[PDB]
Design a protein around this ligand. Structure first.
Ligand SMILES: CC(=O)SCCNC(=O)CCNC(=O)[C@H](O)C(C)(C)COP(=O)(O)OP(=O)(O)OC[C@H]1O[C@@H](n2cnc3c(N)ncnc32)[C@H](O)[C@@H]1OP(=O)(O)O
Ligand SMILES: CC(=O)SCCNC(=O)CCNC(=O)[C@H](O)C(C)(C)COP(=O)(O)OP(=O)(O)OC[C@H]1O[C@@H](n2cnc3c(N)ncnc32)[C@H](O)[C@@H]1OP(=O)(O)O
Ligand SMILES: O=c1cc[nH]c(=O)[nH]1
Ligand SMILES: O=c1cc[nH]c(=O)[nH]1
Ligand SMILES: [Cl-]
Ligand SMILES: [Cl-]
Ligand SMILES: [Cl-]
Lengths: 265, 264
């Protein structure tokens, strides 16, 4: 309900107030940052998702880099679907008919309106993976998004590793660690999960192909627990953007912690 | 979503949606303004993309597809009721809401099909900050250029261009209260009054809140008009999956509507 969102807000959030809140929390010009958001968590915003994207770009600038996950699990093999599952009798029709990934076109699923706004901005570029893409904007946009591997999509050949190499930051706006994509790189590095056979529809040599490949069975339901232990160290900056509880942290910090956590089990 | 899946027999796909459109009477070269509810169709392999691609496959670049891309999010808040907001906020809103930019501004209440449509390559969008439309195909640029600020859905609008082209209206799983073309009947009959409105635009480089006048567009009579119109028998009914659909000529409904409003 928009009703509850308006009832819960004292004054409008605007590009200007958001920009203020972001700077207060520690975002600054030139920073490399991957962002995860819930728009409704902030309270009512004048301009909605556009105001958030504009505020982020204002603070970070073209001399910095904004990254967001642009996952499209709508295109994944339906045998592994539980959110919701679909009947087994549909599975093969989906493989034969789900449209192939095209980075300018394919909508995201479960990423949020901010992401949908962001990925269609001018000068925003998207990585090539049919399930596990990211979108970036700014100084290191091209470098972060190019040459993502089909297999091991969130691993050492992915945008996550490039953010790591850039000593980047993670901003969570009113969401928890189950939305912290970067912790998948901890899974890869720790060998935390099983490999499984997955599939996705791609344009390959100029035609739709249902492509089979192997990826880790990524599982964000362990992340919340990792997050609680991580924040005992006291290296996460916490604060508000409007009504939302937000967290700013160094990506290497949580990735390294997650890797050591999985290894010790 | 579990509800959508359970009420679907086999998946809807590009191939099945194209087939349903063609039985419904859509064909190559047509000019059509489309209004839709994605969930109404049942479960779709590829969601909004599948619908958009199906419409394009049938109509082709020789025809033209139009959709409303309204962004009422940017309007003057004094007139809001869905929901309304405290008066204290109104002026703050006017001074801070971001300018309309056709390649960026999201729609409000148009549906995922429109949000997907408006981002497709070769889809062009008109420049009105509240009542823009998006178009694709032969007459896309014709239909979307030179929309007046004032009288946004009037004689200088895409609705009239569709009218001049003798185009069609396709309603997918939605009723006549989503039938944007009937606002032209409102304009023609003088069925609403004028009001003071505003919008944020890019003017000579900068953001500017621009105050203009427009019709108090009210769709509350549209359902009633639609019921009466369909006794004429000039509306094709059909199914796209689970959704009950309607295909009709735009000049038909617009003229009926104009006549309907003038007799009160
Ligand atoms: S690896 C996986 C990584 N995943 C991520 O990065 C995703 C992180 N985000 C999340 O997990 C979030 O919880 C989400 C996106 C799944 C859901 O959060 P929500 O706030 O519920 O959704 P979202 O961010 O899309 O925002 C849309 C909501 O904004 C609200 N809204 C709309 N306009 C406005 C406005 N002007 N101001 C404030 N809120 C608004 C509406 O309630 C809207 O919901 P609707 O589409 O149902 O109308
Ligand atoms: S002048 C006025 C002109 N106005 C118009 O043209 C508007 C016409 N459309 C309407 O009014 C419609 O009733 C709408 C767009 C307001 C709402 O209809 P909906 O079907 O609820 O929304 P939409 O069409 O955006 O479809 C999205 C919904 O589809 C469902 N959905 C998602 N994926 C799929 C899929 N693969 N298959 C089927 N349904 C799906 C979800 O419920 C989603 O809803 P959520 O946003 O709650 O998660
Ligand atoms: O319907 C869907 C699509 C993707 N993933 C799911 O779990 N369900
Ligand atoms: O919040 C809003 C925005 C536009 N229109 C409304 O009625 N309410
Ligand atoms: Cl940095
Ligand atoms: Cl290591
Ligand atoms: Cl919160």
């Amino acid at each position: 309900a928009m009703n509850d969102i308006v009832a819960s807000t004292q004054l409008p959030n605007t590009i200007k107030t958001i920009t203020n809140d972001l700077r207060k929390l520690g975002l600054k010009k030139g920073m490399t940052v991957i962002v995860h958001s819930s728009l409704s968590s902030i309270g009512w915003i004048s301009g909605g998702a556009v105001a958030v994207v504009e505020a982020l770009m204002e603070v970070i600038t073209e001399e910095g880099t904004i990254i967001m996950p642009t996952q499209s699990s709508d295109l994944s093999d339906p045998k592994h679907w539980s959110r919701p599952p679909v009947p087994e009798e549909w599975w093969q029709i989906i493989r034969d008919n789900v449209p192939a990934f095209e980075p300018h076109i394919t909508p995201t699923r479960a990423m949020g309106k901010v992401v949908e706004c962001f990925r269609t901005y001018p000068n925003v570029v998207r990585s090539n993976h049919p399930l596990g893409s990211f979108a970036a904007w700014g100084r290191h946009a091209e470098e972060i998004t190019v040459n993502q591997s089909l297999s091991m999509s969130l691993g050492e050949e992915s945008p996550l590793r490039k953010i790591y190499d850039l000593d980047g930051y993670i901003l969570l706006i009113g969401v928890g660690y189950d939305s912290n994509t970067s912790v998948h790189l901890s899974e890869v590095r720790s060998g935390a999960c099983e490999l499984i056979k997955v599939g996705a529809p791609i344009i390959e040599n100029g035609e739709r192909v249902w492509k089979e490949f192997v990826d880790m069975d990524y599982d964000s339901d362990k992340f919340v627990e990792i997050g609680v232990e991580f924040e005992q160290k006291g290296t996460v900056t916490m604060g508000k953007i409007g009504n939302a509880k937000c967290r700013l942290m160094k990506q290497r910090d949580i990735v390294d912690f997650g890797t050591e956590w999985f290894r010790k089990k």
